[PDB]
From a paper:
The form 2 crystal contains one monomer of Csd3Δ41 in the asymmetric unit. Interestingly, the side chain of His339 of Csd3, the first histidine of the HxH motif, shows two different orientations. In both the form 1 and the form 2 crystals, domain 1 blocks the active-site cleft of the LytM domain, with the protruding helix α3 contributing to the Zn2+ coordination sphere.
Seven cell shape-determining genes (csd1, csd2, csd3/hdpA, ccmA, csd4, csd5 and csd6) have been identified in H. pylori. Among them, Csd3 (also known as HdpA) is a bifunctional enzyme.
Numbering used by the authors: 41 to 250, 257 to 332, 337 to 409
The structure:
Amino acid sequence: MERLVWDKLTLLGFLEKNHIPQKLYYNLSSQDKELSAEIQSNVTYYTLRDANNTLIQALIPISQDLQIHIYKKGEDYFLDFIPIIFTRKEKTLLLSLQTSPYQDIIKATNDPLLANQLMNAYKKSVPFKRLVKNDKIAIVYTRDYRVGQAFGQPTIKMAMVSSRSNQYYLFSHSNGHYYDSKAQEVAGFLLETPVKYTRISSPFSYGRFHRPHYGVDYAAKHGSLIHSASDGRVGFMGVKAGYGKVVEIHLNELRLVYAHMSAFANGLKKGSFVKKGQIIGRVGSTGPHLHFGVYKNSRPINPLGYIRTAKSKLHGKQREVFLEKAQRSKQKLEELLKTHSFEKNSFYLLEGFLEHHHH
Ligand code: NI
Ligand code: NI
Ligand SMILES: [Zn+2]
């Protein structure tokens, strides 16, 4: 297949451009239409054409693990939402600061995405802002690959920065949030419910085997006020097929989506800075509901996990398992730092983490 980069088309625009009957979109359920609205610009997608240059297949990612599959069978086109098959690689970055955290990470990885994730993860960290030459930064992270090619964003499993001989750790969890070594949340966001809803008509779902919905649908009256769940900056504001009128707001590594609006607030525009609690529009059905979506580092995440008044902590068996892994991870990081000298090199980018050792 040809590997290409998505630019500005909608699904419908893509169908039109390639002479695929547009009913393939119009016939979708409203849930599938919402799903189809999340094709991001710059995603890598795949196409296959026949001798006539007719589009006979396409694979278009809508998340890190779901994609649209369009294919011609006999005389007709079909559209499925299917899993993405991928390979995951783990690396360990070990770094002695030479210039700035950001520049050094780029030097060692050539990856702005990872560098931005670290800055964001430590955004409120006082020791982080006070890092100086020869302070240490370690990151254990994974990246996902499709036929050899990385896609989406990396995932930080563990990070550590040292300042004045003290080490400041954070760890990911399968729930998508970061935790310190006492299993309490760090680098969180306190989001507020953005509308007065009558009920949640459809919660967030990965749709995973034991259905995918990448937001929360809040049933509300047409015209109900919609308030920003957070501070941030408006990125997009307008109409997207499947979402109707929508506002997107960015804050650190979050993108927050508010869809199906009947109207935007007067004077709101692309680039507007907004405050948590500020009115950004009104509920519509462009019956009525607000679709509220949250994306961390490009990946959809359950918004409800961040609507809380306090910082989260892990509990029960989740806490036990976490702390066990955290201890093992900390011990292993020390061993790796002992066995890779910053006299020889300012950084090391190592294959794997727990299994990494020499002979
Ligand atoms: Ni090594
Ligand atoms: Ni061995
Ligand atoms: Zn929805």
